[PDB]
């Protein structure tokens, strides 16, 4: 892992050489976590890392 | 500005959420109330909650 | 179509356990919370907890 | 003069106490007045002490508590029930509350010992308490609300018509007694081998020594215990 806040978490993942050649995109990635979200029953989804 | 309230606000029971006008009803503008709005004023401005 | 403006508020309600709260375990033993009993009121082992 | 066969205990003694674990000895007692003894202070302990928490947080930049300080991993609830545990000792005689404002950054984790450098008028007893984690350049400027108070007291009881914005009415636990044990042991005063010892052991939080915990507990069920006077009953 790169970087850890409430917010976001971003991850750098471990490639190939082959899979680096062929993808576009960087090794990192970063995820967004879900803050205070409704569900279709009123309760709530709060991930934390 | 734009009728909806502050984020961090207290929603007590019976407090605005999201304030609204909606043009009134207008009838034909018979001549006494043509009088009466213009003396007194356009204090029923044609706009209801 | 046919909607000029669309107003979300998501409003966030802090429920604690009360009386009347409905409790359940993983045996079919459900029940409603009668009563909140103060500490010094409760049953309790020898070493006082 | 019927009630002048009783046998008066001495008093209480002392046989090991720090500052939060105590051991305390009440001897020679009646057959069955430890248990009243006991169980009256035990409730009165755990009902009816006095201390100091924080009712309210103001955090720069978080508008409410359901959000998210940007670069610190806890949320604002997580902080909030955090700061819920931090306890607090007098310092200075005669304060009532304070309002503290705190400035840290630099530090990967916020704890209560932070809070000591701009608190004047109160000591922080568990400094280790984690408040929060936050990266090595995340700033956090807050300030809390040290008052003084007896039992529990909700966020709707703590809410301020004249608090600033951002502020956060905070769940108040001011009970300093965590845990009151007693037994009942045997004790023998000459030829009779029927009287009673009665143990206490009490752990407090820190804030009230036991033995100050156990006058004041005294000293309340004496005040309830007065109003049975004959010069009080009409």
Known sequence: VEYVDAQKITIKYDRTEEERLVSFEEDSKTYELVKFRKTNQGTSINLKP | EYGMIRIGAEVKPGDILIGKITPKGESDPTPEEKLLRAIFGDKAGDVKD | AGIMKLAKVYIAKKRKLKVGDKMAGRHGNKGIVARIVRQEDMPFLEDGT | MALLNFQKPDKVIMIDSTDFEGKFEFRPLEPGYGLTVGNALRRVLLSSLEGFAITSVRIDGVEHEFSVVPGVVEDVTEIILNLKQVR????????????????????????????????????????????CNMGPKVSINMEIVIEKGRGYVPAEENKKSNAPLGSIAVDSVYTPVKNVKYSIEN???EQKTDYEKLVFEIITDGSIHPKDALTEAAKVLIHHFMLFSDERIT
Request: glycine content about 6%; charged content about 25%; cysteine-free.
């Open chain 4, 88 to 131: 607090f000792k007098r310092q200075i005689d005669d304060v009532e509350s304070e309002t503290v404002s705190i400035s840290v950054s630099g530090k990967e984790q916020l704890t209560a010992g932070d809070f000591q450098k701009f608190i004047s008028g109160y000591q922080v007893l568990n400094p280790d308490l984690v408040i």
């Open chain 4, 187 to 189: 004790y023998r005063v």
